[PDB]
């Protein structure tokens, strides 16, 4: 047996990620179990298809994969670093706008190399952030088993996700372009910088039928302290139509990244992590009994 399997990392809709250690070299791993579900399999046969086909520094590269009937299992590179959000930023005190933005920036370069080969993410939620290495700020987005294929002019629908992270296109059963994953850009950028979900709701229905409305606001104080740019950022993603949504290579030329190419100022608003804290909380809670998805 090449792999050696060790403690819990994360866990997700289709199983649990273990850190693993490959036997003959020493090199850390994780390892992606599937739960005991047949109906599972597809959606792991999927991310190991979609994760031969990507080729980028902020996408999770492949290693290898084995099965017995009823179960499969995914080796795959290791963010060493964990979960941006658990492991990074609920770490510290205080974060600033502008290393959410380098965040973000990495993520739509993981995104844009998606998109150009004709592929959408579809389920991007704040977990599937990581970061590569521990104390690092280089950004590896994961979870591949809902990507797919789109043709612009022959849509499907998503009939899968996480209730607090789709969008108002997959609540009303129409056709799924790439603008929905910058829908969802738009949405963990508003939890990032303001540490909530501006379409909770008290349960999985009441959220679905805030996104199926699709009104949202920066009412909270802290939105008084983001810079205009990061505002007007997200509310070129957050429109409840698709074709007004700013795409990813627009996204990437949005002012709000120019703050990057600059001295880090001696003068950044220092966001607290509390609110972020809070909402983590609750964001874990929904993964404690495998998926509620459908
Ligand atoms: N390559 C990886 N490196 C480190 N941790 C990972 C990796 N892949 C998954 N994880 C952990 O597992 C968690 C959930 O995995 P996810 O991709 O949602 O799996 P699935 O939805 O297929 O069950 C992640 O948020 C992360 O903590």
Redesign the pocket.
Same mark, same amino acid.
């Given at each position: 047996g090449p792999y050696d399997i060790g403690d819990e990392?994360? &866990?997700?809709?289709? %199983?649990?990620?273990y850190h693993a250690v490959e036997r003959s070299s020493g090199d850390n791993y994780?390892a992606?179990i599937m739960y005991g579900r047949p109906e599972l399999r597809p959606?792991m046969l999927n991310?190991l298809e979609m994760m031969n086909t990507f080729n980028h520094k902020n996408l999770?590269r492949p290693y290898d994969a084995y099965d017995t009937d009823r179960s499969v299992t995914l080796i795959?590179?290791?963010?060493a670093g %964990?979960?941006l959000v &658990?492991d990074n930023l609920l770490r510290r005190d205080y974060y600033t706008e502008r290393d959410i933005a380098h965040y973000i920036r990495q993520t739509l370069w993981g995104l844009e190399h998606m998109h150009e080969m004709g592929v959408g993410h579809m389920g991007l939620t704040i977990? =599937?952030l990581?970061i590569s290495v521990v104390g690092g700020d280089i950004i590896?987005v994961? =979870?591949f088993?809902l990507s797919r294929k789109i043709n612009r002019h022959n849509l499907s629908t998503l009939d899968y996700g996480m209730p607090e992270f789709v969008s108002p296109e997959v609540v009303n059963k129409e056709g799924v372009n790439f603008s929905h994953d910058m829908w969802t850009v738009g949405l963990i950028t508003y939890v990032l910088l303001g540490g909530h979900n501006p379409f909770l709701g008290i349960d999985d229905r009441e959220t679905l039928t805030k996104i199926r409305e699709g009104r949202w606001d920066f009412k909270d104080e802290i939105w008084t302290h983001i810079s205009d740019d990061g505002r007007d950022f997200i509310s070129r993603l957050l429109l409840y139509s698709p074709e007004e949504r700013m795409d990813v290579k627009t996204a990437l030329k949005h002012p709000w990244f120019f703050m990057l190419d600059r001295p880090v100022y001696d003068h950044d608003y220092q966001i607290g992590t509390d609110r972020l804290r809070n909402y983590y909380d609750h964001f874990r809670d929904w993964y404690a009994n495998a998926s509620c998805k459908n």
């Amino acid at each position: 047996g090449p792999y050696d399997i060790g403690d819990e990392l994360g &866990r997700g809709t289709q %199983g649990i990620t273990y850190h693993a250690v490959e036997r003959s070299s020493g090199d850390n791993y994780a390892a992606k179990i599937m739960y005991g579900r047949p109906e599972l399999r597809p959606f792991m046969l999927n991310e190991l298809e979609m994760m031969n086909t990507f080729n980028h520094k902020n996408l999770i590269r492949p290693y290898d994969a084995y099965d017995t009937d009823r179960s499969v299992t995914l080796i795959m590179e290791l963010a060493a670093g %964990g979960e941006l959000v &658990r492991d990074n930023l609920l770490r510290r005190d205080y974060y600033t706008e502008r290393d959410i933005a380098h965040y973000i920036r990495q993520t739509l370069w993981g995104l844009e190399h998606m998109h150009e080969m004709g592929v959408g993410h579809m389920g991007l939620t704040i977990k =599937d952030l990581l970061i590569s290495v521990v104390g690092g700020d280089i950004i590896k987005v994961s =979870d591949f088993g809902l990507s797919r294929k789109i043709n612009r002019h022959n849509l499907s629908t998503l009939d899968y996700g996480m209730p607090e992270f789709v969008s108002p296109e997959v609540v009303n059963k129409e056709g799924v372009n790439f603008s929905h994953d910058m829908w969802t850009v738009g949405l963990i950028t508003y939890v990032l910088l303001g540490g909530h979900n501006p379409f909770l709701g008290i349960d999985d229905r009441e959220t679905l039928t805030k996104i199926r409305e699709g009104r949202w606001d920066f009412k909270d104080e802290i939105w008084t302290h983001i810079s205009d740019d990061g505002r007007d950022f997200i509310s070129r993603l957050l429109l409840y139509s698709p074709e007004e949504r700013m795409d990813v290579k627009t996204a990437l030329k949005h002012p709000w990244f120019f703050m990057l190419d600059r001295p880090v100022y001696d003068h950044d608003y220092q966001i607290g992590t509390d609110r972020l804290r809070n909402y983590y909380d609750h964001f874990r809670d929904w993964y404690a009994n495998a998926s509620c998805k459908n």
